[PDB]
Structure formats: C-alpha cells, structure tokens
C-alpha cells in the first residue's frame, strides 16, 4: 500500500535530509561495506553498516574541526549527527542481526554512502507496498 515496514518510512525521511544538504563533514571517508558484503545478504551489509555509521556520528560529535567553519556549518553538522544516529537506530530493525566487526573495503565519502542506502530503502518502500 504505502508503508510495508514502518522503519522504512521514517528512515527514508531521515536519509533524505543528510544527503539533500551535504557539508564538508560528509567527506570524512568511511568504509564502503557495499564493496565487501557483496557475497552475503542485506542483513550483513547492514550488520557492518550499523557498526560503521554508529562510530561515525558517536566519535565526530565533538570533532569540532569541520563543524567550526564559521557558524552556519557548525549548526548544519550538528543536524547531520542527529540524523546519522536517528537512521542507525532504525537501521538495526531491517538488518535483523545485531553487530559485526568492520573490515574496510574501499572508502565512501558519507554523502555517497547515504545516497546508496537511501535508494535501497526506497526501492523496496514503493514496491513491497504498491
């Protein structure tokens, strides 16, 4: 119909934003798990995913280098962190498992990572439903 797994709907909006308005912080290249969990199921892509992202927002909250540009950026980066965690929390649901070690598999400039994640979510969102 228009909302299979509730998590999705919420996720979508959360992802949507972070990418919509990118900064100089979504370029803090992280692990591009997409190029490793290729030989597994989404669940796992997501197991490592969660781990990766979690660290990202949790560790950079007070990185106060990229969020200390002028004033506007400061405020914008803060929003990103919120959304990163917000999405991570929900993500877990879809994943199905809990957590996994992280084994770098090339790098992704956050903006990109998100873009892919978002697309995926959507693909299912508007298919499984109607």
From Swiss-Prot:
<dbReference type="GO" id="GO:0030890">
    <property type="term" value="P:positive regulation of B cell proliferation"/>
</dbReference>
<comment type="similarity">
    <text>Belongs to the IL-4/IL-13 family.</text>
</comment>
<dbReference type="GO" id="GO:0005576">
    <property type="term" value="C:extracellular region"/>
</dbReference>
<dbReference type="GO" id="GO:0005136">
    <property type="term" value="F:interleukin-4 receptor binding"/>
</dbReference>
<keyword id="KW-1015">Disulfide bond</keyword>
<feature type="disulfide bond">
    <location>
        <begin position="25"/>
        <end position="66"/>
    </location>
</feature>
<feature type="disulfide bond">
    <location>
        <begin position="47"/>
        <end position="100"/>
    </location>
</feature>
<dbReference type="GO" id="GO:0045671">
    <property type="term" value="P:negative regulation of osteoclast differentiation"/>
</dbReference>
<dbReference type="GO" id="GO:0032733">
    <property type="term" value="P:positive regulation of interleukin-10 production"/>
</dbReference>
<dbReference type="GO" id="GO:0032736">
    <property type="term" value="P:positive regulation of interleukin-13 production"/>
</dbReference>
<comment type="function">
    <text>Cytokine secreted primarily by mast cells, T-cells, eosinophils, and basophils that plays a role in regulating antibody production, hematopoiesis and inflammation, and the development of effector T-cell responses. Induces the expression of class II MHC molecules on resting B-cells. Enhances both secretion and cell surface expression of IgE and IgG1. Also regulates the expression of the low affinity Fc receptor for IgE (CD23) on both lymphocytes and monocytes. Positively regulates IL31RA expression in macrophages.</text>
</comment>
<dbReference type="GO" id="GO:0016239">
    <property type="term" value="P:positive regulation of macroautophagy"/>
</dbReference>
<dbReference type="GO" id="GO:0050776">
    <property type="term" value="P:regulation of immune response"/>
</dbReference>
<comment type="subunit">
    <text>Interacts with IL4R. Interacts with IL13RA1.</text>
</comment>
<dbReference type="GO" id="GO:0048295">
    <property type="term" value="P:positive regulation of isotype switching to IgE isotypes"/>
</dbReference>
<dbReference type="GO" id="GO:0045348">
    <property type="term" value="P:positive regulation of MHC class II biosynthetic process"/>
</dbReference>
<dbReference type="GO" id="GO:0120162">
    <property type="term" value="P:positive regulation of cold-induced thermogenesis"/>
</dbReference>
<keyword id="KW-0202">Cytokine</keyword>
<dbReference type="GO" id="GO:0042102">
    <property type="term" value="P:positive regulation of T cell proliferation"/>
</dbReference>
<dbReference type="GO" id="GO:0010633">
    <property type="term" value="P:negative regulation of epithelial cell migration"/>
</dbReference>
<dbReference type="GO" id="GO:0005615">
    <property type="term" value="C:extracellular space"/>
</dbReference>
<dbReference type="GO" id="GO:0008203">
    <property type="term" value="P:cholesterol metabolic process"/>
</dbReference>
<dbReference type="GO" id="GO:0008284">
    <property type="term" value="P:positive regulation of cell population proliferation"/>
</dbReference>
<keyword id="KW-0964">Secreted</keyword>
<dbReference type="GO" id="GO:2000352">
    <property type="term" value="P:negative regulation of endothelial cell apoptotic process"/>
</dbReference>
<dbReference type="GO" id="GO:1901857">
    <property type="term" value="P:positive regulation of cellular respiration"/>
</dbReference>
<keyword id="KW-0075">B-cell activation</keyword>
<dbReference type="GO" id="GO:0043011">
    <property type="term" value="P:myeloid dendritic cell differentiation"/>
</dbReference>
<feature type="glycosylation site" description="N-linked (GlcNAc...) asparagine">
    <location>
        <position position="39"/>
    </location>
</feature>
<dbReference type="GO" id="GO:0048260">
    <property type="term" value="P:positive regulation of receptor-mediated endocytosis"/>
</dbReference>
<dbReference type="GO" id="GO:0008083">
    <property type="term" value="F:growth factor activity"/>
</dbReference>
<dbReference type="GO" id="GO:1900223">
    <property type="term" value="P:positive regulation of amyloid-beta clearance"/>
</dbReference>
<dbReference type="GO" id="GO:0150079">
    <property type="term" value="P:negative regulation of neuroinflammatory response"/>
</dbReference>
<dbReference type="GO" id="GO:0045892">
    <property type="term" value="P:negative regulation of DNA-templated transcription"/>
</dbReference>
<protein>
    <recommendedName>
        <fullName>Interleukin-4</fullName>
    </recommendedName>
</protein>
<dbReference type="GO" id="GO:0042116">
    <property type="term" value="P:macrophage activation"/>
</dbReference>
<keyword id="KW-0732">Signal</keyword>
<dbReference type="GO" id="GO:0030183">
    <property type="term" value="P:B cell differentiation"/>
</dbReference>
<dbReference type="GO" id="GO:0045582">
    <property type="term" value="P:positive regulation of T cell differentiation"/>
</dbReference>
<dbReference type="GO" id="GO:0010628">
    <property type="term" value="P:positive regulation of gene expression"/>
</dbReference>
<dbReference type="GO" id="GO:0150076">
    <property type="term" value="P:neuroinflammatory response"/>
</dbReference>
<dbReference type="GO" id="GO:2001171">
    <property type="term" value="P:positive regulation of ATP biosynthetic process"/>
</dbReference>
């Amino acid at each position: 119909m228009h909302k299979c797994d509730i998590t999705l709907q919420e996720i979508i909006k959360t992802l949507n934003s972070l990418t919509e308005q990118k900064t100089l912080c979504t370029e803090l290249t992280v692990t591009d798990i997409f190029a490793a969990s290729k030989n597994t199921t989404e669940k796992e892509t997501f197991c490592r995913a969660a781990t990766v992202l979690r660290q990202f927002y949790s560790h950079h909250e007070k990185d106060t280098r990229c969020l200390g540009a002028t004033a506007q950026q400061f405020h914008r980066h803060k929003q990103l962190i919120r959304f990163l965690k917000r999405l991570d929390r929900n993500l877990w649901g879809l994943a199905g498992l809990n957590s996994c070690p992280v084994k770098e598999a090339n790098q992704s400039t956050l903006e990109n990572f998100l873009e892919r994640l978002k697309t995926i979510m959507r693909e299912k969102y508007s298919k499984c439903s109607s």
